[PDB]
Design an enzyme around this catalytic site. Structure first.
Site, mmCIF file in Angstrom:
data_model
loop_
_atom_site.group_PDB
_atom_site.id
_atom_site.type_symbol
_atom_site.label_atom_id
_atom_site.label_comp_id
_atom_site.label_asym_id
_atom_site.label_seq_id
_atom_site.Cartn_x
_atom_site.Cartn_y
_atom_site.Cartn_z
ATOM 1 C CG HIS A 15 -0.344 0.269 2.540
ATOM 2 N ND1 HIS A 15 0.142 1.499 2.953
ATOM 3 C CD2 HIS A 15 -0.147 -0.577 3.582
ATOM 4 C CE1 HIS A 15 0.628 1.392 4.181
ATOM 5 N NE2 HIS A 15 0.443 0.148 4.594
ATOM 6 C CB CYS A 16 1.176 4.197 -1.717
ATOM 7 S SG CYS A 16 -0.292 4.668 -2.655
ATOM 8 C CD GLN A 17 0.240 9.585 1.437
ATOM 9 O OE1 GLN A 17 1.159 9.833 0.654
ATOM 10 N NE2 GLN A 17 -0.476 10.532 2.019
ATOM 11 C CB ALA A 18 -4.126 6.875 -3.002
ATOM 12 N N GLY A 19 -2.845 3.659 -3.380
ATOM 13 C CA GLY A 19 -2.713 2.556 -4.341
ATOM 14 C C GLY A 19 -2.635 3.011 -5.781
#
Length: 144
Positions: free
Chosen positions: A87-91
């Site tokens: 994951h990141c902050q929003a994919g």
């Protein structure tokens, strides 16, 4: 909205990394957090193994340096038969670039094909020119 890129690989965002109820119903045992600032959510519970790749979504960020670390982690998650969330902050950009690159090297796919598969499951992905360009060098260097 965690997108199953594979039987053993799921790609999601920040809210995805928090849904523990969901995560162990999917059998996640591994987490890759592709951020510099976010917690390793649920770390204190002793449930998962974690790796942070402290990257930002800038046109100056280098992800190629993390490519290897992420693969070794993802492959171990395969070898052990449990899921992995990335994951990141929003994919959209950071964590997807890494998925595209693994789908390149540890599945038989070119970038166009690896990118196409992932966008077909998770159509919000939009790696930026810098990440795209780093995916291209990775293609050359593999097929050197």
């Amino acid at each position: 909205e965690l997108t199953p890129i594979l039987p053993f690989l799921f790609l999601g965002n920040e809210q995805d990394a928090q849904d523990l109820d969901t995560m162990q119903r999917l059998n996640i045992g591994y987490v890759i957090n592709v951020t510099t600032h976010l917690p390793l959510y649920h770390y204190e519970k002793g449930l998962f193994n974690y790796k942070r790749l402290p990257a930002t979504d800038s046109n100056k960020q280098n992800l190629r340096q993390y490519f290897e670390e992420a693969f070794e982690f993802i492959e171990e998650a395969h070898q052990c038969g449990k899921g992995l969330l990335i994951h990141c902050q929003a994919g959209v950009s950071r964590s997807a670039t890494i998925v595209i690159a693994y789908l390149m090297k540890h599945t038989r796919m070119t970038m166009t094909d690896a990118w196409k598969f992932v966008k077909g499951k998770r159509p919000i992905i939009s790696p930026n020119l810098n990440f795209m360009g780093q995916l291209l060098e990775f293609e050359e260097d593999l097929n050197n």
